[PDB]
C-alpha cells in the first residue's frame, strides 16, 4: 500500500506490510544460557539478497537448503568455514513482482530436515544416492524434478502442516517467514548438516494471453537472526 524504505547494516530492501505480514513457527529465535550439554551483530544482520530465479509457464519448482545457501557467499559465509559450531534463526522474505494481468499462486514453505531422494534407474541399477550438488545446491538453488512427492515421496498436499505462506498475485506478491533454530543438538556444523530447506512450489501455474513477458522473477531476500558461533579455525 504505497511506499517502502527498509535498511539495515549495509543492505536495503523496499517491501511493505499491507497484506499478510509475518509467519513464525510460534517461536521467535533466541539464545541459550546453559552448559552446552561469539554473537555477531554488526555484520551478519544484513539482508543477503539472493539471485532472482526466473519462472516459466512450465516450471516445476525450486528449493534452497539452509544454511548451505550462504555458507560460500557473504561475510557470514566466511565465518562459517573458519568456525565449526553453528546456531541461528532466519528472516526469509520472498518477493515476486508481476502485473495484475498475470495469475498463478505459489507456495513458500520451509521443510526442516529436508532429506531428498532421486529416482533409481538410468541403466538397470537398483540403488543410488544423490550427489553433493543436489543436497547442497548453494545460492543458485536447484530446480526440483518431481514436485508432487518433493523428490522424497512426500505429498505437497500436506506440506502446509509446516510453516508456509501463499503467494497469490491476485492478492499478495510478497512472503515473509521467520525461522528459529531447529535441532536435536544445540549446535551443529553448518557445513555438513544443512537444517531446514526452503522450497518454492507453484501449484496454479503462471498464465497470460499472447505477448506479455512470460517470465516473472522471484526475488528471494533473507537475513539471519540470533546467529551464534563458538570455536574458530585458522585462516589461509
Amino acid at each position: 500500500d504505497r511506499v517502502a524504505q527498509l535498511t539495515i547494516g549495509n543492505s536495503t530492501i523496499t517491501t511493505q506490510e499491507a497484506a499478510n505480514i509475518i509467519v513464525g513457527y510460534g517461536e521467535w529465535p533466541s539464545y541459550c544460557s546453559d552448559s552446552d550439554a561469539t554473537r555477531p551483530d554488526v555484520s551478519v544482520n544484513r539482508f543477503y539478497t539472493l539471485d532472482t530465479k526466473l519462472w516459466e509457464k512450465s516450471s516445476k519448482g525450486w528449493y534452497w537448503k539452509f544454511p548451505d545457501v550462504l555458507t560460500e557467499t557473504g561475510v557470514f559465509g566466511q565465518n562459517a568455514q573458519f568456525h565449526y559450531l553453528y546456531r541461528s534463526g532466519f528472516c526469509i522474505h520472498v518477493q515476486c513482482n508481476a502485473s495484475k494481468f498475470h495469475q498463478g499462486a505459489l507456495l513458500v514453505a520451509v521443510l526442516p530436515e529436508y532429506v531428498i531422494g532421486t529416482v533409481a534407474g538410468g541403466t538397470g541399477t537398483e540403488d543410488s544416492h544423490p550427489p553433493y550438488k543436489q543436497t547442497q545446491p548453494g545460492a543458485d538453488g536447484f530446480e526440483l524434478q518431481h514436485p508432487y512427492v518433493l523428490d522424497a515421496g512426500i505429498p505437497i498436499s500436506q506440506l502446509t502442516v509446516c510453516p508456509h505462506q501463499w503467494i497469490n498475485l491476485r492478492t499478495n506478491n510478497c512472503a515473509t517467514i521467520i525461522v528459529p533454530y531447529i535441532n536435536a543438538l544445540p549446535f551443529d556444523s553448518a557445513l555438513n548438516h544443512c537444517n531446514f530447506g526452503l522450497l518454492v512450489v507453484p501449484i496454479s501455474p503462471l498464465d497470460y494471453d499472447q505477448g506479455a513477458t512470460p517470465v516473472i522473477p522471484i526475488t528471494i531476500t533473507l537475513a539471519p537472526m540470533c546467529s551464534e558461533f563458538a570455536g574458530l579455525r585458522q585462516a589461509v
Binding site: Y25, G26, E27, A37, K100, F101, H102, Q103, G104, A105, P112, H146, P147, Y148, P155, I156, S157, Q158, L159, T160, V161, W166, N168, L169, R170, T171, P180, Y181, I182, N183, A184, P186, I203, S204, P205, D207, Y208, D209, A212
Partner: protein, 223 residues
C-alpha cells in the same frame, strides 16, 4: 509369608497392557530433555491445519499429475453449469486422501466434528465473476440445479471482491453429505486476462474434531 492365590490370567502376555517392566540399565541417565520448537502432544493439532484437498483426479500420466490440486474455471462453456463436486467424508477413499486429515483418519475408524473448507482463487487481479458453493446434508442427493441448490445452505462467492472464502462444514458423524460448486455468474476476463483460471482448495478440521479407535492402514515395503 504373605498368602496369595493366583487369580487366573497369570503368565499371560498382553500386547496392550500398560505395565511397567524391569529396566536393562537402572544406572543410566539419558540425554536430558532439551527444548525443541514445534512440539506436538496430540494429533488434533494437525487436523486444524489447512491442507490441500485433491479434488481433480487424473493421473495421465505423471507430468499432469500435479493438476490434481486445481480446478478448471473458464469462460467456456459458461453460466450455470456445474463446476465441481466432491464427497464430504475424510475416511472415504478418497479425494480427501490428500489431506493429512484424511490420512490420519485412515489410522482411525470413528469420526465426529465440523470441517472447514477454504477455497483460494488464483486468477488475475482484473478477472471477476461470482460462483455458488452449496452444502448438501446426507439425506437428499445432489440438487440438480443452482435454483434448488440455493435453497439449501449455500455461499455466494465473488472473485473481484474477495479471493479467499471459507466454507464451514457444520457436522459429521456415523450417503454422507455433498458439496457442490456452481457457476452463478459468467467468467469475466477483461482483455488480456486468460479465459481460463485455476482454483486451489484447502481443507481442515474444526477444533471439536475427534477420532476414537486406533487401526492401521496400507503401505508396502520390499527388501
Amino acid at each position: 509369608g504373605f498368602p496369595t492365590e493366583l487369580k487366573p490370567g497369570t503368565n499371560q502376555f498382553l500386547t496392550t497392557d500398560d505395565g511397567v517392566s524391569a529396566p536393562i540399565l537402572p544406572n543410566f541417565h539419558p540425554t536430558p530433555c532439551i527444548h525443541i520448537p514445534g512440539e506436538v502432544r496430540n494429533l488434533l493439532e494437525l487436523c486444524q491445519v489447512e491442507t490441500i484437498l485433491e479434488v481433480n483426479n487424473v493421473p495421465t500420466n505423471a507430468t499432469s499429475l500435479m493438476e490434481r490440486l486445481r480446478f478448471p474455471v473458464s469462460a467456456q462453456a459458461g453460466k450455470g453449469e456445474l463446476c465441481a463436486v466432491f464427497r464430504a467424508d475424510p475416511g472415504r477413499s478418497g479425494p480427501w486422501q490428500s489431506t493429512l486429515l484424511g490420512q490420519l483418519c485412515g489410522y482411525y475408524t470413528q469420526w465426529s466434528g465440523s470441517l472447514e473448507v477454504t477455497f483460494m482463487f488464483t486468477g488475475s487481479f482484473m478477472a471477476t465473476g461470482k460462483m455458488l458453493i452449496a452444502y448438501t446434508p446426507p439425506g437428499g442427493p445432489l440438487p440438480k440445479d443452482r435454483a434448488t441448490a440455493m435453497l439449501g445452505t449455500h455461499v455466494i462467492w465473488d472473485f473481484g471482491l474477495q479471493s479467499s472464502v471459507t466454507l464451514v462444514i457444520p457436522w459429521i458423524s456415523n450417503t454422507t453429505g455433498l458439496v457442490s460448486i456452481w457457476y452463478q455468474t459468467n467468467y469475466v476476463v477483461p482483455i488480456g486476462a486468460p479465459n481460463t483460471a485455476y482454483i486451489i482448495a484447502l481443507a481442515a478440521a474444526q477444533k471439536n474434531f475427534t477420532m476414537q479407535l486406533c487401526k492401521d492402514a496400507s503401505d508396502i515395503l520390499q527388501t
